[PDB]
């Protein structure tokens, strides 16, 4: 094949042009996103039961939903969260790889069969299914800087004149609103209701009757009488469209003209649907929008379009409004693209410089510069054809594979140049001989790299996708590079080389070149005689090999393991949990204190604090609170003392003094879609039907037991809310009936006075909005106030609510959790800074084994993924080992020679482990990928050396020692050149300061250690293995 | 421009020193292996 | 304006027409709920009477030759053709007397 | 009962807001009549499978149901893959005039 | 000459062919009843069949 | 027309515009691929250019 294309340079040029065109077309159209679909598909069902405690929502709503959601295939695990506010959330997480667009239909259809089995209020509110594993492209906050608009006004303005336009641009998927639009609130007044002899049911009936739409029909009906010529539409009563119209609703009119109006008994205003969440941006009331990227869309273009559309609206922005972007993900993608371009340019310049330094010929230097971009475009085209995207992992694989492309180019060019120098033949025949000698080795190493990288893509779960991106990119790059080396490069060696005379290797000239050649030749002679001397003996270095092996094993065992390193994303969360029974006022005070601290003592680091009151990751309620703190750009935060870790450590140290609140601060995981906390999630599940008190006592005992080992477990905290006092009202049914009061009236009054009822819909400024009915604050705020409400009996008299009702106190849980259909509770927390996660998991399992009988344990979230390393058992590494053994035995006919090649594998793993231990990084996915790359490079060097030695031994009559020494003398310049190129090209990865530098640091350190140690300890060791294998198996 | 110039100068001052260390390990390993081989 | 301008070039554009009904007059019945409640009638009765008489109200289903078909209730042509016919309908008050 | 203005104001506004975002969406057009009926036609990009397109349309529609007005929530929202022009209309006549 | 003739040539998408069937649409003044539309359709069908 | 009023073809006209807006790319790509095939097959860059 290579000699075939040598005589036809333009055939190779045509193939290159086709590949370049394919790469350009691929780069023209390709989705761009921060991360691929890494998290497993998840569907969340949300339902609302206004003014209902946790128990009512749990038994009457989510029980029926959970019962009727059985039979869904590919279901991994289900969780359920009820609340005292009245919201229930059921999250179903499926297996990885399934089509979510069908699972959503399945769960929705199964839910629609249980709709008539739910109470009426939840049906009127409505339930909604959605996909929670989508991640937020950006959040757009809108704030008021004068004090006119409130949260409700801002939310309605966004819902009316911002949501549609922002949703109707290009590339935008789901758009979520963090507020609620307007709603006509009707605040009763018990004094006025008693004055006119009315009850809330009368107001509800009047609103239902006087705020309806009637199908009037049509003038000149559908069957017309003979001789009709007029036809029109009749417009009868319609929905009320203003507060002044709602205030004129009649409630009681006598025959003499006396009337009672709704405004005479209640206050009508325009408010929100629920006053449960208060959002303040830097101390000002604010609302927000969440924009998610649609599938198969460009992130940067969508962001630019969103920014332009938002900047269009300022002339029409009313009053004082400001638009801010607390959190967006585009800078990471821009940084990734910039790093890719920088690495490509640096590699090209570096390889040109090193080729000029060594080969001294410009025509030799120019050959790879017109070959590496061809392979890059081919990789782009193949990756586009397969169905991948431009993530932050594929480009990392490309910057990793640049070294492989450079290695192939260096090998081919150096071999042809040395053949020409030592043979005297001109470029044509020298290229023919070199290609004929090296084609088998090239095919063998391509097959070896494919065999070592493909099985990594067969992992399951999130790790499966993370490995899949790198594996696909690497194998595509290797295949394209070897195809290019077979087709395009031999033509280049045929045409663009100068046939210089033998012996003119720069020794005829002085300066840097001749002198450098002098020490290079002297060092080559020294190395050759040294390796000959060491090869004279065999058993002296077997003990060194065993020492290296045992040291590598000890380092592998000692090195801690984790899942994925933390990164400085510029955003971190702060959580506030007040004691049980705390109201909104104290939470607002604590949030104000936190905001003041952040904006006063960290002015040079933070940029804005988006405080949210009433909602927390643990559980919604008037007891918790959250705050998303965003930092300035990484350019303005120099040093390691101004990163996320130091900032959050100082923040929690300072917040430890905040009384009446346990304020914590933490950093969100690098992949935001998978989980919300950086630590493991552990779940205790009741099985023997103990109840709730036993479960709580067991959880407290386990927490105390785990807190007694402050060496591997840190920040072990519950994820729920503790039990709270509750008010119990008991109505004397027979007393109420005796007095003449119907039970229905009492129940309706109690449910519409303190809980609030949703009655009808109305048209406001050209849109549909609900109307809500509830008492006016001061009459529903203390227990004694329950005596202020009056109910009409049959006789027409009004009886007070305190004449037939009592009251008492109780204890109840404000948040009930369920896992897989059983009551359960969750403990979430990280591990020690100096130990592996798996050891903490094992110790937590051992601690849970000591629990009282009847309580089981389980994992969820990333922990479950960490428990999916059963495929990471040697059952897969061994498969790869046998596959590469078979490939090596097939490349050259021997069942024993590949042992020498495999013996070089530990010599790079030892260096990778040394670098990891020196830097202190843990064993994670990126380090594993770098280790595999180093193993592949060492195997490539071993393949080249062994193949050259075997060819010299077989084709000619050279003896074992003589052929081995000649081969190792011959394969010295390419190895050193490739090692120098790789080591110098991976400098920025190790030296990277910030901007998502954790993965870069880990991979660069692993690559540096592996490459340096393999280059140092392979030239001296591979010949020993070769000669030992040949003599022992002679 | 400035970034391109700094990248070039950094590359050309870092290649020769790195090649120097690599030849240093070559020399050191060769000598120690020669010493140990003859016991 | 666009149609008027496009009608000026018969040599290139033929049968240039809109797609949709233009605009129609509509009838609005103002019910004085104040007077209606003073007399004794209820808003629900008025609304149901108007909707059933002029618009027609789907009530129930019935089997017919082994097939389920709906039963409709609607005024009989003559009394729902002109605005003045709105004076022919009567509503029962609270005390049983019938008011136009 | 609702006329063209209020129907187009309430139903198809939110429906059109929610429908946007589906993959390979070419263009969406809506009509609101006077008899209360409202129609939305979403034409997708060529080569897309119509079945999964209907599936995605249903998924996106069922999210907007809570925001929809109460009456239409149980009125019946029908989603179907349909063309524009009739393939064939077959007529039935009476040959003796005894049947209207 | 090629360039000039390419510029001159008018553009279209697809030719229209005889199929044996065509349609007629009738729109009366707004507010018209069924009887007037029936009369207009009777005129149209009488013309077509005569 | 007065400002704020735009236009957009739909239905058949959308496909007509799409057909009329994609021809030059097709012509250029076809010419390029034919030239490349000729150069690869019959050798020399003079034969395909002629």
Curated annotation (Swiss-Prot), chain A:
Sorted UniProt keywords: Cell inner membrane, Cell membrane, Membrane, Transmembrane, Transmembrane helix, Transport
Protein name according to UniProt: Multidrug efflux pump subunit AcrB
Subunit structure, as described in the record: Homotrimer, with large domains that extend into the periplasm, interacts with AcrA and TolC. AcrA may be required to stably link this protein and TolC. Interacts with AcrZ. Part of the AcrA-AcrB-AcrZ-TolC efflux pump.
Primary localisation category: membrane
Natural source organism: Escherichia coli (strain K12)
Gene: acrB
Knockout mutant characteristics: Loss of susceptibility to contact-dependent growth inhibition (CDI); inhibiting cells still contact the target.
Assigned protein family: Belongs to the resistance-nodulation-cell division (RND) (TC 2.A.6) family.
InterPro entries cross-referenced by the UniProt entry: AcrB_DN_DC_subdom (IPR027463), Acrflvin-R (IPR001036), MdtF-like (IPR004764)
Transmembrane segments: 10-28, 337-356, 366-385, 392-413, 439-457, 466-490, 539-555, 872-888, 899-918, 925-943, 973-992, 999-1018
Signal peptide: none
Protein location: Cell inner membrane
GO biological-process terms attached to the record: alkane transport; bile acid and bile salt transport; enterobactin transport; fatty acid transport; response to antibiotic; response to toxic substance; response to xenobiotic stimulus; xenobiotic detoxification by transmembrane export across the cell outer membrane
From Swiss-Prot, chain B:
Protein name from the UniProt record: Multidrug efflux pump accessory protein AcrZ
Organism field: Escherichia coli (strain K12)
Major subcellular site: membrane
GO cellular component: cell outer membrane; plasma membrane
Interval of the full protein contained in this chain: 1 to 39 of 49
Cellular localisation: Cell inner membrane
Side Periplasmic, residues: 1-7
GO BP annotation list: response to antibiotic; xenobiotic detoxification by transmembrane export across the plasma membrane
Transmembrane segments: 8-28
Entry similarity comment: Belongs to the AcrZ family.
Curated annotation (Swiss-Prot), chain F:
Cytoplasmic side: 39-48
Compartments, record wording: Cell inner membrane
Source domain of life: Bacteria
Inducing or repressing factors: Positively regulated by MarA, Rob and SoxS transcriptional regulators (at protein level).
Transmembrane segments: 22-38
Annotated knockout phenotype: Loss of susceptibility to contact-dependent growth inhibition (CDI); inhibiting cells still contact the target.
Annotated disulfide bonds: none
Chain's role: AcrA-AcrB-AcrZ-TolC is a drug efflux protein complex with broad substrate specificity that uses the proton motive force to export substrates.
Subunit text: Homotrimer, with large domains that extend into the periplasm, interacts with AcrA and TolC. AcrA may be required to stably link this protein and TolC. Interacts with AcrZ. Part of the AcrA-AcrB-AcrZ-TolC efflux pump.
Protein family per UniProt: Belongs to the resistance-nodulation-cell division (RND) (TC 2.A.6) family.
Protein name per UniProt: Multidrug efflux pump subunit AcrB
Taxonomic lineage from the root: Bacteria, Pseudomonadati, Pseudomonadota, Gammaproteobacteria, Enterobacterales
Span covered, complete protein: 851 to 900 of 1049
């Amino acid at each position: 094949m290579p000699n075939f294309f040598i005589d036809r340079p333009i055939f190779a040029w045509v193939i290159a042009i086709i590949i370049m065109l394919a790469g350009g077309l691929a780069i023209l159209k390709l989705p761009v996103a921060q991360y691929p679909t890494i998290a497993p598909p998840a569907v969340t069902i949300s339902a609302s039961y206004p003014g209902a405690d946790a128990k009512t929502v749990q038994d009457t709503v989510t029980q029926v939903i959970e019962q009727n959601m059985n039979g869904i295939d590919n279901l991994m695990y289900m969780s359920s969260n009820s609340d005292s506010t009245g919201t229930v959330q059921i999250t179903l997480t499926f297996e990885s790889g399934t089509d979510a667009d069908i699972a959503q239909v399945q769960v929705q259809n199964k839910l629609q069969l249980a709709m008539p089995l739910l109470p009426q209020e939840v049906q009127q509110q409505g339930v909604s299914v959605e996909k929670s594993s989508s991640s937020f492209l950006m959040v757009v906050g809108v704030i008021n800087t004068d004090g006119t608009m409130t949260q409700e006004d801002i939310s309605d303005y966004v819902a009316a004149n911002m949501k549609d336009a922002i949703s109707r641009t290009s590339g935008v998927g789901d758009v979520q609103l963090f507020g609620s639009q307007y709603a006509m609130r009707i605040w009763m007044n018990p004094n006025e209701l008693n004055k006119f002899q009315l009850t809330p049911v009368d107001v509800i009936t009047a609103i239902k009757a006087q705020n309806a739409q009637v199908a009037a029909g049509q003038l000149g009906g559908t069957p017309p009488v003979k001789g009709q010529q007029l036809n029109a539409s009749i417009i009868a009563q319609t929905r009320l469209t203003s507060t002044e119209e709602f205030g004129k609703i009649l409630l009681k009119v006598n025959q003499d003209g006396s009337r009672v109006l709704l405004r005479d008994v209640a206050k009508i205003e325009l408010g929100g649907e629920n006053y449960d969440i208060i959002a303040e941006f830097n101390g000002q009331p604010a609302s927000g929008l969440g924009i998610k990227l649609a599938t198969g869309a460009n992130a940067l273009d969508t962001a630019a379009a969103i920014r332009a559309e938002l900047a269009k609206m300022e002339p029409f922005f009313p009053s004082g409004l400001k638009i801010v972007y607390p959190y967006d993900t585009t800078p990471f993608v821009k940084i990734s693209i910039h790093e890719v371009v920088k690495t490509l340019v640096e590699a090209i310049i570096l390889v040109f410089l090193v080729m000029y330094l060594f080969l001294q010929n410009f025509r030799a230097t120019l050959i790879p510069t017109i070959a590496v971009p061809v392979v890059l475009l081919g990789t782009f085209a193949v990756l586009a054809a397969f169905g991948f995207s431009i993530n932050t992992l594929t480009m990392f694989g490309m910057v990793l594979a640049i070294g492989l492309l450079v290695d192939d180019a260096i090998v081919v060019v150096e071999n042809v140049e040395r053949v020409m120098a030592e043979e005297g033949l001109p470029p044509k025949e020298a290229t023919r001989k070199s290609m004929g000698q090296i084609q088998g080795a090239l095919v063998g190493i391509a097959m070896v790299l494919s065999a070592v990288f493909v099985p990594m893509a067969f992992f399951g779960g999130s790790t499966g996708a993370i490995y899949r991106q790198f594996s696909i990119t690497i194998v595509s790059a290797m295949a394209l590079s070897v195809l290019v080396a077979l087709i395009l490069t031999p033509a280049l060696c045929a045409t663009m080389l100068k046939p210089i005379a033998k012996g003119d290797h720069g020794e005829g000239k002085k300066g840097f070149f001749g002198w450098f050649n002098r020490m290079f030749e002297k060092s080559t002679h020294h190395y050759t005689d040294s390796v000959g001397g060491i090869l004279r003996s065999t058993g002296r270095y077997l003990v060194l090999y065993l020492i290296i092996v045992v040291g590598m094993a000890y380092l592998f065992v000692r090195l801690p393991s984790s899942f994925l390193p933390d990164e400085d994303q510029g955003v971190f969360m702060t959580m506030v949990q007040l004691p049980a029974g705390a109201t909104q006022e104290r939470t607002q005070k604590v949030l104000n204190e936190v905001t003041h601290y952040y904006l006063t003592k960290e002015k040079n680091n933070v940029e804005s604090v988006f405080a949210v009151n009433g909602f927390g990751f643990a559980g919604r309620g008037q007891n918790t609170g959250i705050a998303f703190v965003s930092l300035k750009d990484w350019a303005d935060r120099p040093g390691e003392e101004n990163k996320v870790e130091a900032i959050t450590m100082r923040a929690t140290r300072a917040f430890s003094q905040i009384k009446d609140a346990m304020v914590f601060a933490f950093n969100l995981p690098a992949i935001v879609e998978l989980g919300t906390a950086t630590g493991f999630d552990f779940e205790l599940i009741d099985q023997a039907g103990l109840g709730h008190e036993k479960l709580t006592q067991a959880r407290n005992q386990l927490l105390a037991e785990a807190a007694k080992h402050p060496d591997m477990l840190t920040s072990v905290r519950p994820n729920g809310l503790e039990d709270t006092p509750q008010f119990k009202i008991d109505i004397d049914q027979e007393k109420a009936q005796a007095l003449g009061v119907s039970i229905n009236d009492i129940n309706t009054t109690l449910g519409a006075a303190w809980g609030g009822s949703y009655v009808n819909d109305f048209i406001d400024r050209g849109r549909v909005k609900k109307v809500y009915v509830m008492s006016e604050a001061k009459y529903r705020m203390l227990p004694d106030d329950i005596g202020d409400w009056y109910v009409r009996a049959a006789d027409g008299q009004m009886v007070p609510f305190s004449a037939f009702s009592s009251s008492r106190w109780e204890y109840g849980s404000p948040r009930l959790e369920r896992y897989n259909g059983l009551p359960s509770m969750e403990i979430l927390g990280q591990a020690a800074p100096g130990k592996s996660t798996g050891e903490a998991m094992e110790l937590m399992e051992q601690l849970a084994s000591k629990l009282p009988t009847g309580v089981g344990y389980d994992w969820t979230g990333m922990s479950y993924q960490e428990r999916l390393s059963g495929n990471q058992a040697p059952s897969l590494y061994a498969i790869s080992l046998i596959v590469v053994f078979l490939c090596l035995a097939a490349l050259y006919e021997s069942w024993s020679i590949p042992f020498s090649v495999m013996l070089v594998v530990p010599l790079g793993v030892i260096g990778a482990l040394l670098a990891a231990t020196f830097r202190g990084l843990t064993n994670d996915v990126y380090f594993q990928v770098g280790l595999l790359t180093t193993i592949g490079l060492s195997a490539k060097n071993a393949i080249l050396i062994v193949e050259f030695a075997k060819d010299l031994m077989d084709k000619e009559g050279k003896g074992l020692i003589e052929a081995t020494l000649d081969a190792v003398r011959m394969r010295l310049r390419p190895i050193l050149m490739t090692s120098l190129a790789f080591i110098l090209g991976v400098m920025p990865l190790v030296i990277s300061t910030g901007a998502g530098s954790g993965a870069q640091n880990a991979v660069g350190t692993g690559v540096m250690g592996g490459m340096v140690t393999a280059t140092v300890l392979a030239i001296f060791f591979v010949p020993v293995f070769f000669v030992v294998v040949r003599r022992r198996f002679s | 421009m400035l970034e391109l110039l700094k990248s070039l100068v950094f590359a050309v001052i870092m290649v020769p020193v790195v090649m120097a260390i690599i030849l240093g390990l070559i020399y050191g390993l060769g000598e120690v292996f020669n010493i140990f081989s003859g016991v």
